[PDB]
Structure formats: C-alpha cells, structure tokens
Design a protein around this ligand. Structure first.
Ligand SMILES: *[C@@H]1O[C@H](CO)[C@@H](O[C@@H]2O[C@H](CO)[C@@H](O)[C@H](O)[C@H]2NC(C)=O)[C@H](O)[C@H]1NC(C)=O
Ligand SMILES: *[C@@H]1O[C@H](CO)[C@@H](O[C@@H]2O[C@H](CO)[C@@H](O)[C@H](O)[C@H]2NC(C)=O)[C@H](O)[C@H]1NC(C)=O
Ligand SMILES: *[C@@H]1O[C@H](CO)[C@@H](O[C@@H]2O[C@H](CO)[C@@H](O)[C@H](O)[C@H]2NC(C)=O)[C@H](O)[C@H]1NC(C)=O
Ligand SMILES: CC(=O)N[C@@H]1[C@@H](O)[C@H](O)[C@@H](CO)O[C@H]1O
Ligand SMILES: CC(=O)N[C@@H]1[C@@H](O)[C@H](O)[C@@H](CO)O[C@H]1O
Ligand SMILES: *[C@@H]1O[C@H](CO)[C@@H](O)[C@H](O)[C@H]1NC(C)=O
Ligand SMILES: *[C@@H]1O[C@H](CO)[C@@H](O)[C@H](O)[C@H]1NC(C)=O
Lengths: 225, 327, 83
C-alpha cells in the first residue's frame, strides 16, 4: 500500500511540474530582476545630464578643450552616479540571496541527511524523508511526509481503577468501542487488551478526576490456575 | 515586529513641485524616478508578504465551543470577547492601547503637511479585524486539538489529557499531572493574571515595536525638511526663482536645486531598503516561532522561552506579534 | 481620459474610489490585492468584480471532555519546495 501511494505521488509531482507553467517563479523572478538592472544601466548611457550631447566623441569632434572639459565633467558625474546606484542595489540583492542560500544549506543538512522534528520545516505533516534536485541557479526539495486521514471518535478516560490502584498507559491512550476498553497508540488505531505489561501503577484511585472503573487482565493468573 | 508602514513617494511632486520647466530639466537625467518608484513599490509589496507569511498558517477557521469546561484552566484573558465592537481579547486591547501609533493613512496635521508634498501612505492588505480572526483560529485549534491541526485534520482531545501529553514530552511521567491538576490550574491562571497586570503597569514594555514606528517617522520628517535647503541657489522656493529670473539664467539655479533634492531621495530610498531587510529577517524569525512553538512542541533550548517548553499562544499587536510561552 | 468615468458602478473602499468594477456580496479567496481587505478578480458575460476576501472555510471542532478522535488510515504525501 505504501509503495503504491509513494509511486503514485511521485507521478503526480511529475505531471504537476509538467503542466503548470508558473511553478518556478521564485527562481524566474531572480533572473528577471538582474537582467532588468543591467538594462537600465545600459540606457543610462543615452541621457544628456545637461551636456550638449550624450555621445562623447561628438563632444570631442566638435569642441576645443577648455569647454569640452566642462561638458565632459557633467557627463562623468552622471555616469558615475548611475554606477553607484547599480552597485548599491546589487549589494542588497546579494545579501538576500545569501540569506536564502543559508536557509537552503540548513534544509539540506537537516531534512536530507537526517530526519527532522521541527514542525512545518520540511513540508506539511510528519516528516519522513527528502530528496534534492538541482535547478538552474537553485535547488528543489521533494519532501515525503505522512498525513493521517480517516478518523473515528472514541470515549476515553485518563486512568483505570482496578483494585484501589490507578493504572496509566505506558504508551498510548485508553479508548472505548462503546462497551469495552482498549489501549491504543496515539497515531494509528489498533486496539489491544489492557494487560499489566503495557500499564504502570501509580497510587490509589481517589485522587484522579474522571477515572473509570474496569478490570486489567493479568497474564500470570490463567497460567497458574 | 512583523511589518512597517508602506510609504510611496512621487518624485515629480517632490522634486519639481508643480512646474513644467523643472519637469523638462528633470527629463535630462534619464530614469532615476522610475527606479525609485520600483524600489519603493517592491518594499510595499514585501510588507504584505511578511504579514501573510506569519499569520496565515492554517486555512480553516476553527471556533471554540460555547461550553468552557477545560478541566479547571481558564483562557478568558486570551480568548476573544464578544462584548466589544472589534472581537478582540483584553490582552490585545492593552497591546493596542499601549502603542502610540502615528501616520494612520486612511482616507480624509503634520501628516497633511507630509501629504501635500507627494508623500502617501498606503493601507495594508489585511485589516486589524482579520488578523484577530487568524489569531482566534490559532488559539481555538490549539486548545481543542493540540498539535494535530497543523499536520492534517483536526482531532479533538480533552485538554488535561493534552497537557499530560505535553509533560510526557519533556521527560516527566504523566501521573504527575493527574495527581496535581488543581495546583497546575491555579498556577496557570495566576501567571496569566500577572502577565495582564505587569503589561498594564510597565509603560516601556513594547519598545521593540515603538522604535520601529519612531524611526520611520523620523526618516520622513527629515526628508520634508530637505525641501527648505538652498543647496547654493538663491532661494529654496522654486516659484520665486521662476517668478524673478529669465529662463537662460534660472535654468542654472533650478539644476542645482534638482541635484540636491535628487540626492536626498536617493539617501532616503537606500536607508529604507536596509530597514526593510532588517524587518524581513525579523518576520522570518516570527514565522519560524509560530510554526514551531505554537503549532507543535519545541525541544530547542531557549527558543520558545526560558525553561522546558510546554505550549504557546499568539496575540496580535500593531505591526507585530506577541507570544506567551507557557513553560 | 473620460470614457470610463461615466461608470454607474462606482465603489468606495477605504483605499479610495474604484470605478469600472461591480461589487458583489460574496467572499472568495484573493486574486488581485487592492487593499483594506478588498480584492478584485475577473469572473462572471465576463466582468471585473471586487469583493471582500475570505480567510477560509469555517470549521467547528466537536470538543468534549471525554472524547478523542483517532485516525485509522494514512496518506503518503510528496510536496515540493524551491529555493
Ligand atoms: C467492543 O469491542 C468488542 C471487541 O471484542 C466487540 O465485541 C465482539 O463482538 C463480536 C460480534 O460483532 C463477537 O463475535 C465477539 O465475541 C465480541 N467480543 C467479545 C470479547 O465478546 C464489540 O462489538 C465492541 N462494541 C461495540 C459496541 O461495537
Ligand atoms: C476566568 O477568569 C476571569 C478573570 O477575569 C474570571 O472573571 C472574573 O470572575 C470574578 C468572579 O465573580 C468576578 O468578580 C470578576 O469581575 C470577573 N472578571 C472579569 C474580567 O470578568 C472568570 O470568572 C474565570 N472563569 C470562570 C469560568 O470562572
Ligand atoms: C486505507 O486507505 C487506502 C487508500 O488510501 C485504501 O486502499 C484502497 O482500497 C480500495 C478498496 O476499497 C481499493 O479499491 C483501492 O485501489 C486502494 N487504493 C490503493 C492506492 O491501493 C485502503 O483500503 C484503506 N484501508 C483501510 C483499512 O481503510
Ligand atoms: C467508579 C466505581 O464504580 N467505583 C466503585 C464505588 O462506587 C464502590 O462504592 C466501591 C465499592 O465496591 O467500588 C468502586
Ligand atoms: C471616510 C470619509 O472621508 N468619508 C467622507 C464622508 O464623510 C463625506 O460626507 C463625503 C462627502 O464628500 O466624502 C467621504
Ligand atoms: C463522535 O462519535 C460519537 C459516537 O461516540 C457521535 O455521537 C458523535 O456525533 C461524533 N461526532 C462527530 C463530530 O463525528
Ligand atoms: C465531563 O463533563 C460532564 C458534565 O456534563 C461531567 O458529568 C463529567 O464527569 C466530566 N468528565 C470528566 C472526565 O471530567
């Protein structure tokens, strides 16, 4: 069953990436912004900045030096300001990408090389494993997780009074079909008879509120009698 | 902190305020103003992305049942109160009244003096009435289902049995809780009440939020003051230079004023970009704490309060979030 | 331009004045963000509608002081994450 569900889920990942075109926008936007910045920088070469022309050789081929100096200084001031703007914005974007790369390194170390217990760090549900794949300028994780879904209701009680002693579950919880009482682990329904080997005794049964009266089967008494 | 104030600046009303000649001089500088509007619009989008990342963790709106037999625990100081026009908890009321918020920015002072020079404040996408609804959904899911609502379908469980599970997490055997339920109930209620009174008394508690607001206002303030500087021209008023001098000599003065005002805008935009990076780092930390302290139980030491962590409750605050860690 | 300002479907939001979009009484998930809890989308004979965005489906958990819900079956789910 788990083999079939796993293979089917990988196939749905295949088809969902093969059909939806806006999936990889987190990568794509990065590329777009970089190209956009360079584009603006190139068309800052066409601005006059107050000079006679935006072409430097037309200032050179027309004017004598004592005023060609004056126009060229204005052009230099404008173009240098454009470079400083571009470099500052590139520094800030590089800081953002470095933060994203540190997060990717943390996910690679913890989701892939081990099993994580942080909630919603390695996908939705209880985490089982992860597989990395490369992407152009980025990484793609496939998180394989466990999601429990078909629930029923039962009626519980925190303890069982048997012989003036309160019995508590070693691991799990006490549930009821409606008539009997069983011990069940907390994430999958499989009822078991309440024995001495999966409960522990603690005190008498006059302190705990909501304790229900039942019997606990001892595995030794039918062996002797 | 989670988000800051979305602000938009129009160049042409700031630099060449209501002038055609100054606009024609400004067109020779290329595309600075398209760049500035792109940067500020990017920040304004990222603020809403921060708030949506932090609070919108679940996609169903749970509701607490009207009966309140939680085994002795009393959540009345964090649950929403139906007897108020905005359905908020009283701790959220104190948090709203502590912060002296400025620059409200709804449709209609010093805010008007800022407004008349091309400075605008955009409203956030999520109002304060829907952030309270996410907060109420998170508390209802936590107190009626445990941690399972953040990992699948919500499964109900009695509250002292959930709290026994949480002692079983930190290495204390669960018979400790069931034999001391009244004591734990009294300690928990008294601790919540002391949180109420301590926040009601100390005035400097919320400085982490307040400083953020202050810094933003300060930046806007000095930007407005940079309109009053001469920069070497004969006046700081553009209409006087226009009303006195002929164009071939007034162009030289107006160019100097344009250079100074454009440098002021670039300084303001650079510092806003750096502050937005700081706030985004804080919002990512808040999202991590919401996913790991609230929706589950953490085992990282001192990540979710000092001591052995049991559970946590979120509350909203103006431009921020407040966690109560029960430990 | 004045060929839109005729309107007859003007709307007043806390973000400003919206012209050219009809207001509905439903609540959907957000498509294009406008502000103050108002989003807008393109739907039905097709038009542009503006609505109050909906946070999500309402759910009520049947809490009780002696009742638990336990799963019986499970699902293996594979999700992606791009960085
Ligand atoms: C309570 O659980 C018991 C589990 O044994 C169920 O009782 C069994 O019922 C079948 C008939 O459906 C009998 O053949 C078995 O002998 C019963 N078991 C015992 C130990 O007597 C019972 O159905 C459950 N209660 C309800 C209300 O479903
Ligand atoms: C939960 O705690 C609140 C604390 O505010 C209790 O409300 C107070 O109850 C006393 C008892 O009569 C009143 O004198 C106070 O005026 C109440 N204060 C408020 C603000 O309502 C509340 O009773 C507790 N819950 C339960 C179920 O007892
Ligand atoms: C648990 O769930 C799985 C599916 O999640 C069930 O498997 C299906 O069972 C039906 C039988 O009615 C088959 O027709 C399907 O082909 C099965 N699906 C797969 C993927 O194998 C399974 O029966 C459930 N088990 C219980 C005890 O409820
Ligand atoms: C929960 C329950 O049934 N408790 C019973 C109690 O009522 C009875 O008095 C006692 C004596 O037999 O045995 C036990
Ligand atoms: C929120 C707000 O500003 N509302 C006003 C309203 O009070 C006023 O009567 C109307 C007239 O123009 O304009 C709008
Ligand atoms: C839970 O199960 C009980 C049966 O013990 C039933 O009466 C109740 O209606 C169920 N509640 C829900 C929400 O399914
Ligand atoms: C649950 O509440 C009911 C109130 O109708 C009460 O009779 C019952 O004893 C309570 N059960 C527990 C375990 O506290």
């Amino acid at each position: 069953l788990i083999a079939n569900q796993f293979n089917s889920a990988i196939g749905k990942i295949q088809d969902s990436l093969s059909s939806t075109p806006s999936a990889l926008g987190k990568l794509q936007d990065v590329v777009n912004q970089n190209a956009q910045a360079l584009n603006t920088l190139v068309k800052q070469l066409s601005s006059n900045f107050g000079a006679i022309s935006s072409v430097l050789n037309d200032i050179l081929s027309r004017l004598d030096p004592p005023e060609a100096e004056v126009q060229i200084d204005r052009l230099i001031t404008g173009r240098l300001q454009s470079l400083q703007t571009y470099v500052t914005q590139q520094l800030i974007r590089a800081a953002e990408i470095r933060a994203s790369a540190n997060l990717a390194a943390t996910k690679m170390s913890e989701c892939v090389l081990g099993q994580s217990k942080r909630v919603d760090f390695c996908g939705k549900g209880y985490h089982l494993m992860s597989f990395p794949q490369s992407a152009p300028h980025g990484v793609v994780f496939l998180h394989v997780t466990y999601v429990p879904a078909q629930e029923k209701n039962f009626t519980t009680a925190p303890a069982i009074c048997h012989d003036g002693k309160a019995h508590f579950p070693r691991e799990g919880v006490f549930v009821s079909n409606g008539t009997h009482w069983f011990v069940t682990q907390r994430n999958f329904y499989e009822p078991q008879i309440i024995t001495t080997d999966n409960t522990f005794v603690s005190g008498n049964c006059d302190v705990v509120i909501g304790i229900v009266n039942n019997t606990v089967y001892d595995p030794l008494q039918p062996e002797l009698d | 902190p989670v988000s800051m104030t979305k602000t938009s600046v129009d160049c042409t009303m700031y630099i060449c305020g209501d002038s055609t000649e100054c606009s024609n001089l400004l067109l020779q500088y290329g595309s600075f103003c398209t760049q500035l509007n792109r940067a500020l619009t990017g920040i304004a989008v990222e603020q809403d992305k921060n708030t949506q990342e932090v609070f919108a963790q679940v996609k169903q709106i749970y509701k607490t049942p009207p009966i309140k037999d939680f085994g002795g625990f009393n959540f009345s100081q964090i649950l929403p109160d139906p007897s108020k026009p905005s359905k908020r908890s009283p701790i959220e009321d104190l948090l709203f009244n502590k912060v002296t918020l400025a620059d409200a920015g709804f449709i209609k002072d010093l805010i008007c003096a800022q407004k008349f020079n091309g400075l605008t404040v955009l409203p956030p996408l999520l109002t304060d009435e829907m952030i309270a609804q996410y907060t109420s959904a998170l508390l209802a899911g936590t107190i009626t289902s445990g941690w399972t609502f953040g990992a699948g379908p919500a499964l109900q469980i009695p509250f002292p049995m959930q709290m026994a599970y949480r002692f079983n997490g930190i290495g204390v055997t669960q018979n400790v809780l069931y034999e001391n339920q009244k004591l734990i109930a009294n300690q928990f209620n008294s601790a919540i009440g002391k949180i109420q009174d301590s926040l009601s008394s100390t005035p400097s508690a919320l400085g982490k939020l307040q400083d953020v607001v202050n810094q933003n206002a300060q930046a806007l303030n000095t930007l407005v003051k940079q309109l009053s500087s001469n920069f070497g021209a004969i006046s700081s008023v553009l209409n006087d230079i226009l009303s006195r001098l002929d164009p071939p000599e007034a162009e030289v003065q107006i160019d100097r004023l344009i250079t100074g005002r454009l440098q002021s805008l670039q300084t303001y935009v650079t510092q806003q970009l750096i502050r937005a990076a700081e706030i985004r780092a804080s919002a990512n930390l808040a999202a991590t704490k919401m996913s790991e302290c609230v929706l589950g139980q953490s085992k990282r030491v001192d990540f979710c309060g000092k001591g052995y962590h049991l559970m946590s409750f979120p509350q909203s605050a103006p431009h921020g979030v407040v966690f109560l860690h029960v430990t | 331009w004045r060929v839109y300002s005729t309107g007859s479907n003007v709307f007043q939001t806390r973000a400003g004045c919206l012209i050219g979009a009809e207001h509905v009484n439903n609540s959907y998930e957000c498509d294009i963000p406008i502000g103050a809890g108002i989003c807008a989308s393109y739907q039905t004979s097709q038009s542009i509608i503006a609505y109050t965005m909906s946070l999500g489906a309402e759910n009520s958990v049947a809490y009780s002081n002696n009742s638990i819900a336990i799963p019986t079956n499970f699902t293996i789910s594979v999700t992606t994450e791009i960085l």
